[PDB]
Design a binder for these strands. Sequence first.
RNA 1: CUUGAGUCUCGUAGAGGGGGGUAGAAUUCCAGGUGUAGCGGUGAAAUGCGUAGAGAUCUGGAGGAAUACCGGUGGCGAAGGCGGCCCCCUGGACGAAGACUGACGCUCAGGUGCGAAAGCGUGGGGAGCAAACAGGAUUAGAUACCCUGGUAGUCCACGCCGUAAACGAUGUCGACUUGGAGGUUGUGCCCUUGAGGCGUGGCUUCCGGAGCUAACGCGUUAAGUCGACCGCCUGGGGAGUACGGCCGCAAGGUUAAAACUCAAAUGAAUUGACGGGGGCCCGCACAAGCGGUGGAGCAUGUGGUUUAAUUCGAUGCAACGCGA
Lengths: 117, 70, 155, 67
Amino acid sequence: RKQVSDGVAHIHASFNNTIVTITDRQGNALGWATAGGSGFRGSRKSTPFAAQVAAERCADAVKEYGIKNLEVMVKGPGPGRESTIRALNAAGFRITNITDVTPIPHNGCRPPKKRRV
Amino acid sequence: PVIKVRENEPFDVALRRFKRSCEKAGVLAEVRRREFYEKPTTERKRAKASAVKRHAKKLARENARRTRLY
Amino acid sequence: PRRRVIGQRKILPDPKFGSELLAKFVNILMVDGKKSTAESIVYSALETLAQRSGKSELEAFEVALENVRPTVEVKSRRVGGSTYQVPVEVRPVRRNALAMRWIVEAARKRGDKSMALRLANELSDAAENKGTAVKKREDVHRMAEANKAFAHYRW
Amino acid sequence: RKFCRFTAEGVQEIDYKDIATLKNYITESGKIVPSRITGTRAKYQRQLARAIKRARYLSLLPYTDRH
RNA sequence: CUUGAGUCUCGUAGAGGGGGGUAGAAUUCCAGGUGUAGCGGUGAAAUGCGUAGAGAUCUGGAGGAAUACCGGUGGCGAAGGCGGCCCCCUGGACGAAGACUGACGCUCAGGUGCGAAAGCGUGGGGAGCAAACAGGAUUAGAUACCCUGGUAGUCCACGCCGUAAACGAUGUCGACUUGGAGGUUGUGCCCUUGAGGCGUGGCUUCCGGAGCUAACGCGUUAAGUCGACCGCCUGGGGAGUACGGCCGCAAGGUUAAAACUCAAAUGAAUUGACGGGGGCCCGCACAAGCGGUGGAGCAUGUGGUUUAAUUCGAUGCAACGCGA
Ligand SMILES: [Mg+2]
Ligand SMILES: [Mg+2]
Ligand SMILES: [Mg+2]
Ligand SMILES: [Mg+2]
Ligand SMILES: [Mg+2]
Ligand SMILES: [Mg+2]
Ligand SMILES: [Mg+2]
Ligand SMILES: [Mg+2]
Ligand SMILES: [Mg+2]
Ligand SMILES: [Mg+2]
Ligand SMILES: [Mg+2]
Ligand SMILES: [Mg+2]
Ligand SMILES: [Mg+2]
Ligand SMILES: [Mg+2]
Ligand SMILES: [Mg+2]
Ligand SMILES: [Mg+2]
Ligand SMILES: [Mg+2]
Ligand SMILES: [Mg+2]
Ligand SMILES: [Mg+2]
Ligand SMILES: [Mg+2]
Ligand SMILES: [Mg+2]
Ligand SMILES: [Mg+2]
Ligand SMILES: [Mg+2]
Ligand SMILES: [Mg+2]
Ligand SMILES: [Mg+2]
Ligand SMILES: [Mg+2]
Ligand SMILES: [Mg+2]
């Protein structure tokens, strides 16, 4: 509805899925798209291509808002830390800032036990 | 790792600058370490093993600087 | 093929139109080393095709090839606990070979009286973009668009 | 190639109040640079790191670049 | 008597110990805003979560636990162990110079104290993690590995327990015996001339000489050469078990046999072979292809059955149109 023209792209890049959320400067979400919701399930979901498709879908989900430039906040170690950024640029956006916001505890909680696979 | 794109900066080189900043900060490696708990006995063993390997290559290099393969 | 680099056997052009492209077609159609009967089928089918659609025989055959020739296929790479179909672009030489084989198999499955009629209808259908041969190209391409996620990353 | 500035200036105790030098031994993200890279002696590195932690408490240097 | 062992003076480094504060990341939870169909998870899934609005994202709040980077075959401690920062209380070590005491030393059965984790008692606390447990998978089964959850416990106080591959699988103390490259921490001297030179202590890592060793290896931090004292071993199993004593709230700990049974058990190294170890390289091995076999009728061989006899032999590949 309203035009903001200055958004922020939040990219949640886990080992299993990629969630792309576009919001304004104050954190209010405008649209989102995920690899799982873009026609990829199981193995195909955790692929850089699937993350890239999700970024493209999130662009059309937000194009009515008339966003010109936006910042990129990348969180997570998984695949799709990169392809989603290129897909956002290829969607016709001005990438102004790129910052990593992965939560890095300073020796906080005890992580789960090692998988014996 | 906060990257700001400069004027007349192509996006591709800005992305490349972002990869380096993350790499020098060791963000990806940190998350790998913290995915599962490592018993203190294990990391002490792992740290010692890495120290031995690091030292072993330093000494092994000298004998390869003294050997004529042919 | 582990180490042996293999060159290429040269094929003689067909006696009538002098085309290396068509000489491969009669080889694929030929069964049990009956080359003479194979080219008779091909030549008569081309004669029917040329009259049925106006274009020169060689040009008409080419048009059918363009409508059947694939550009991407899926190779198979097993993964621990699953099998992955990796999309890979196909070489121009293998492009023609796959198209020629698909037309021949489609013609053999058709219900027409003679093999020449079986063949001639197939290039006619292929030139108009319908039939089993082009349907195979559709299936191969759809399979390779669905697995675009595994391309490059698992090449 | 990298030598210890502290040892070459006879710095005695590194001062948490001297922000100018401390920024030379923290990364862009605020992490403490290892002495392997800066070439500082082990004795001053312990003093240097200790000093940085106090500055961080006093909010003279960031803990992280995000904050 | 002063050379062993101590005391004093001045300094140095240190996650040494106890107590009390505090800070910043992050997880979880609570409330709210934006927002919409998925999230989560796996080898693949499903349980689970979600239109009662999740996940994602932003703001505010609560609480517990642990201290990224520094960080180092770095440091300290008798060992167990000790890692944010600050204060209070406190132990030891080391160095410099001189003074002092004058063998006051070493070891140590019994004894006493300390002693990871788990566990136990009482009272607190409880975010994350996670025995038990529950569900979903996997499977021939799966009381497992994997997934979603999850109680004790992990945290604090005070007691108890006294065990670990509590390991350097190497008791303590002292003396002696070629070297090399480092780490760490003192200190003396020299145009300080420097991001210098020459010494002299403590601790420590990796090589390696003689010597030693069954060998592997150890090698001035000895497993070398010696001295002092202590602990301990005497084939494998039975068995660190039974009984007894002592200790413990309990779990159990400690001390510690015998009958019986065997001709071995074991250590290191060697040659092979093997590996759901690694590396390199091949082969119609796979892949890329074409044509078959397995179904039909018949030919033929074999098994089986049958028969008075169905002669004998060949039996994974490498027997079965084979001896024929
Ligand atoms: Mg998990
Ligand atoms: Mg409901
Ligand atoms: Mg002291
Ligand atoms: Mg006297
Ligand atoms: Mg005793
Ligand atoms: Mg405990
Ligand atoms: Mg308790
Ligand atoms: Mg309680
Ligand atoms: Mg579990
Ligand atoms: Mg179960
Ligand atoms: Mg859990
Ligand atoms: Mg014991
Ligand atoms: Mg231990
Ligand atoms: Mg022992
Ligand atoms: Mg040695
Ligand atoms: Mg015996
Ligand atoms: Mg006996
Ligand atoms: Mg007992
Ligand atoms: Mg007893
Ligand atoms: Mg082998
Ligand atoms: Mg094949
Ligand atoms: Mg048959
Ligand atoms: Mg027979
Ligand atoms: Mg015989
Ligand atoms: Mg026989
Ligand atoms: Mg025989
Ligand atoms: Mg034969």
